Amino acid sequence: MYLRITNIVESSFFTKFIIYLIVLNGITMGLETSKTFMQSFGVYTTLFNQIVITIFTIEIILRIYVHRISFFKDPWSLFDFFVVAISLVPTSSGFEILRVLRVLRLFRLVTAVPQMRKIVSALISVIPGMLSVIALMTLFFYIFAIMATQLFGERFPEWFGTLGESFYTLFQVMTLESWSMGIVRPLMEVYPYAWVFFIPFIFVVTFVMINLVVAICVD
Amino acid sequence: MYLRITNIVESSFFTKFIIYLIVLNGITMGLETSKTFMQSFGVYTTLFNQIVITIFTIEIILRIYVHRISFFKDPWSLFDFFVVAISLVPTSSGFEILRVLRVLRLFRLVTAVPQMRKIVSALISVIPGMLSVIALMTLFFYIFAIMATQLFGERFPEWFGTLGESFYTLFQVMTLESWSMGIVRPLMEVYPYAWVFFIPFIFVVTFVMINLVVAICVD
Amino acid sequence: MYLRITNIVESSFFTKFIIYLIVLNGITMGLETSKTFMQSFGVYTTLFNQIVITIFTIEIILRIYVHRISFFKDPWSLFDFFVVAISLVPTSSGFEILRVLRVLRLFRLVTAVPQMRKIVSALISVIPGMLSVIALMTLFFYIFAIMATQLFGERFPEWFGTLGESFYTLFQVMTLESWSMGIVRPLMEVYPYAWVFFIPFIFVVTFVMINLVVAICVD
Amino acid sequence: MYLRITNIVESSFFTKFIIYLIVLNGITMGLETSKTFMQSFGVYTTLFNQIVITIFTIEIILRIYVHRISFFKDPWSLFDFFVVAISLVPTSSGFEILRVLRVLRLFRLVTAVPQMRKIVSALISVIPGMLSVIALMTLFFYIFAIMATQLFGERFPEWFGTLGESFYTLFQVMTLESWSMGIVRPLMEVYPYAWVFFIPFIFVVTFVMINLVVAICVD
Ligand SMILES: [Ca+2]
Numbered sequence: 001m002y003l004r005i006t007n008i009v010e011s012s013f014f015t016k017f018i019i020y021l022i023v024l025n026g027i028t029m030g031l032e033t034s035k036t037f038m039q040s041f042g043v044y045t046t047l048f049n050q051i052v053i054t055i056f057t058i059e060i061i062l063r064i065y066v067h068r069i070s071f072f073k074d075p076w077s078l079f080d081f082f083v084v085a086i087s088l089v090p091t092s093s094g095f096e097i098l099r100v101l102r103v104l105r106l107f108r109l110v111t112a113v114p115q116m117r118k119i120v121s122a123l124i125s126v127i128p129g130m131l132s133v134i135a136l137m138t139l140f141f142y143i144f145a146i147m148a149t150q151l152f153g154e155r156f157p158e159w160f161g162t163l164g165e166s167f168y169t170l171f172q173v174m175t176l177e178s179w180s181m182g183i184v185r186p187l188m189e190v191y192p193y194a195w196v197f198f199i200p201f202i203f204v205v206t207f208v209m210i211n212l213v214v215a216i217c218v219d
Numbered sequence: 220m221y222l223r224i225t226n227i228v229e230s231s232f233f234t235k236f237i238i239y240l241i242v243l244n245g246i247t248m249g250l251e252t253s254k255t256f257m258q259s260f261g262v263y264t265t266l267f268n269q270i271v272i273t274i275f276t277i278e279i280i281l282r283i284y285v286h287r288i289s290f291f292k293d294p295w296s297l298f299d300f301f302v303v304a305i306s307l308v309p310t311s312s313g314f315e316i317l318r319v320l321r322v323l324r325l326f327r328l329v330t331a332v333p334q335m336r337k338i339v340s341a342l343i344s345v346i347p348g349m350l351s352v353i354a355l356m357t358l359f360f361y362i363f364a365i366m367a368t369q370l371f372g373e374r375f376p377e378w379f380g381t382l383g384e385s386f387y388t389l390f391q392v393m394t395l396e397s398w399s400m401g402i403v404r405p406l407m408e409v410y411p412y413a414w415v416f417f418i419p420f421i422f423v424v425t426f427v428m429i430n431l432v433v434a435i436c437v438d
Numbered sequence: 439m440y441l442r443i444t445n446i447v448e449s450s451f452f453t454k455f456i457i458y459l460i461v462l463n464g465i466t467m468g469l470e471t472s473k474t475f476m477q478s479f480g481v482y483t484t485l486f487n488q489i490v491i492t493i494f495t496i497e498i499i500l501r502i503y504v505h506r507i508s509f510f511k512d513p514w515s516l517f518d519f520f521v522v523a524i525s526l527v528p529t530s531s532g533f534e535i536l537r538v539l540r541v542l543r544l545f546r547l548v549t550a551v552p553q554m555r556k557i558v559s560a561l562i563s564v565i566p567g568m569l570s571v572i573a574l575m576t577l578f579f580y581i582f583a584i585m586a587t588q589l590f591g592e593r594f595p596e597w598f599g600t601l602g603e604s605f606y607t608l609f610q611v612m613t614l615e616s617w618s619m620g621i622v623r624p625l626m627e628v629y630p631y632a633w634v635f636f637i638p639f640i641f642v643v644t645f646v647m648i649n650l651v652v653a654i655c656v657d
Numbered sequence: 658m659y660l661r662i663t664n665i666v667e668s669s670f671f672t673k674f675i676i677y678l679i680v681l682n683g684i685t686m687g688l689e690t691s692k693t694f695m696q697s698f699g700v701y702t703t704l705f706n707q708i709v710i711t712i713f714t715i716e717i718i719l720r721i722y723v724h725r726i727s728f729f730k731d732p733w734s735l736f737d738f739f740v741v742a743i744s745l746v747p748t749s750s751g752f753e754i755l756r757v758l759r760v761l762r763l764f765r766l767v768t769a770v771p772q773m774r775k776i777v778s779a780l781i782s783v784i785p786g787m788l789s790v791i792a793l794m795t796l797f798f799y800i801f802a803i804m805a806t807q808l809f810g811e812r813f814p815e816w817f818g819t820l821g822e823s824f825y826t827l828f829q830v831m832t833l834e835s836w837s838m839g840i841v842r843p844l845m846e847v848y849p850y851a852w853v854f855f856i857p858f859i860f861v862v863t864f865v866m867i868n869l870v871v872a873i874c875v876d
């Protein structure tokens with residue numbers, strides 16, 4: 001029966017049947033957004049949902065026999081497994097993000113369809129070359145996030161009161177969003193020199209960020 | 220009579236005469252902005268407008284005899300047809316955007332002058348090589364737009380209440396405009412971890428965007 | 439006496455002397471900012487200012503005899519002429535910007551110190567290859583600016599009431615600064631569909647600017 | 658005894674020992690953020706802190722005997738000396754930013770681990786090649802900062818009242834953060850033409866920045 005199913009799994013029909021379901025389950029998840037729609041045809045799509053969930057575990061079960069060990073070494077497959085596992089956790093108990101994390105199965109459209117995998121792979125591949133920089137920034141953020149918590153956190157605890165808060169605020173300054181009117185002109189009503197902290201921070205952080213892009217335009 | 224008019228239409232005078240009307244109609248449209256101007260010379264320029272509107276259909280009528288099927292397979296010609304057709308719809312009924320969409324005819328200065336044609340063509344040509352990324356993103360947006368509506372839409376209906384509202388708001392985050400103080404800090408007053416949704420959303424979307432630019436700096 | 443002064447002008451001493459005054463007059467202009475300073479050494483500097491202005495007309499007079507027609511064909515030289523000229527208009531009458539436009543003479547440090555000429559020249563040279571695009575956009579701005587004035591100017595005359603007001607606002611959206619919370623969300627309270635005008639606008643305008651940058655990174 | 662210690666300092670175990678203390682002291686500083694932690698184990702940490710500071714002085718002393726002049730001509734060594742020195746100034750007196758500047762010792766993780774050095778060095782190296790542009794800009798800022806102070810400082814002293822105040826405000830505009838709704842629309846309620854100062858300012862500074870990025874994207 002092995003080759004019987006190895007022929008079912010590898011079939012164009014099977015793979016296109018899966019893809020057909022993703023675009024259907026995606027269309028159905030956009031409709032579950034409408035509180036109106038849910039009042040009318042709610043039970044339909046709650047069932048239609050659970051149906052697809054079964055179908056998908058059946059496939060992943062079928063797909064595992066055909067591949068065994070090879071499957072739990074395939075990034076795209078590992079994903080598909082974990083993205084379905086989330087969708088099996090009872091619609092209750094634990095955390096309720098789990099109900100919401102269910103929309104992640106629509107990322108199977110990236111998995112099930114090539115060109116997409118290509119494009120995703122193309123993107124992902126750029127990451128190892130960046131880890132040296134990324135390592136650098138996180139060190140850098142960490143260092144300033146500490147200075148900031150202990151330099152500004154007493155008077156301005158919303159923004160800098162906690163290590164985590166500083167991270168967030170520094171990040172915000174890094175995206176350069178409302179950094180002056182929002183954070184530093186305020187800080188300067190109390191700490192006139194706060195500009196001496198944040199302008200150098202902005203330069204260094206924006207510089208590094210430019211360099212990193214130039215690097216991705218050389219690989 | 221064909222070759223007679225084929226020599227009228229294909230003439231330098233013809234082409235340059237059309238260009239003369241565009242730069243003239245365009246000037247007349249900047250003046251129709253002023254309520255002052257309209258109180259004095261409004262009659263002049265409404266009629267001048269209708270005149271130019273005739274002339275342009277006449278030309279398009281002429282241009283179609285000279286080209287027949289060659290024309291409805293010309294992108295630039297198709298445009299001029301549609302844009303003039305808009306300008307034909309009676310200054311009444313339906314939607315006032317049809318009155319406003321009339322200004323689209325000034326895009327004929329792009330259509331009727333090469334170099335422009337080249338430049339526009341240069342730009343457009345870059346697009347097909349972005350469609351893999353663009354497709355990828357819209358899936359990504361759609362997934363997160365869905366996540367957002369069910370995570371934040373009950374307490375925050377202005378911003379995430381409807382799928383469409385999530386889209387707009389997610390877009391707003393992508394352009395990084397007032398993303399934190401405008402959206403995520405508020406959100407965090409009620410949902411402390413919302414940074415876990417938006418910091419990742421930001422990284423991915425800005426990453427993809429950098430890559431997309433790097434792609435264009437190859438081709 | 440001609441070659442005598444051609445030996446005065448072309449001298450190393452002459453140029454470095456001009457340069458030395460620039461750095462001095464520049465330092466002196468940052469000091470004229472201080473209302474404190476002016477209350478003490480103010481006359482010292484007002485006269486110092488009037489002195490250097492003479493020295494500069496003398497130079498421009500000298501440089502003209504030594505170069506005659508070749509001079510009024512030199513960008514850098516024309517500049518110092520027009521810049522020094524501005525600084526000759528009495529400290530009175532007409533407009534009061536002219537007194538303020540005086541500090542433009544510090545741009546002579548660019549004109550008079552090589553390598554600066556290089557860098558400026560390096561920079562300026564790029565503009566020709568952007569002219570086709572820059573043209574394209576101004577047509578584009580102009581068309582949308584007209585559309586906006588007649589679509590939003592009645593309810594929102596601060597932002598869109600006038601052709602020029604619209605220019606400014608569209609410019610502001612293009613730098614993507616406070617475009618949503620500041621302009622488009624407000625607009626949507628009256629015109630639900632304004633997002634149909636501003637999202638495509640942003641895309642086009644951002645796209646074009648990416649292409650223009652990619653273009654520069656080839657030439 | 659020299660070669661005895663030269664073999665200690667140059668030992669892999671030594672360096673790895675140093676790197677160990679850095680990652681350890683860095684963990685300690687993250688914990689010194691918690692007002693909680695300090696009440697519990699504050700003493701443990703302030704002592705562990707002074708211990709590490711000792712060890713590092715011992716090291717730098719050792720390191721200097723083994724390198725002498727070679728050391729004080731080494732960027733990375735000079736750094737480590739100057740960073741450890743800051744941490745030596747007693748917990749008392751002068752400026753208390755000195756207590757805060759202590760956390761700068763976590764930059765030793767950049768100094769002591771290569772690849773980081775590589776990456777930092779890669780970054781730093783681009784700077785000499787940017788100095789022509791950087792000099793040009795600062796003169797530019799200086800010229801406009803002076804103009805701005807005398808054009809807007811009377812009615813708007815928060816933003817332009819002082820040379821330094823103008824620098825900051827112009828800097829804020831350059832990062833394009835809230836430049837319109839926050840600054841120029843205000844300015845225009847009093848000075849209708851201020852757009853004539855800031856739009857040209859914005860173009861130039863943004864132009865220069867695109868060139869500087871492209872310049873790097875070759876070198
Ligand atoms: Ca912003």
Ligand SMILES: [Ca+2]
Pocket residue numbers: 178396397616835
């Ligand atoms: Ca803002």
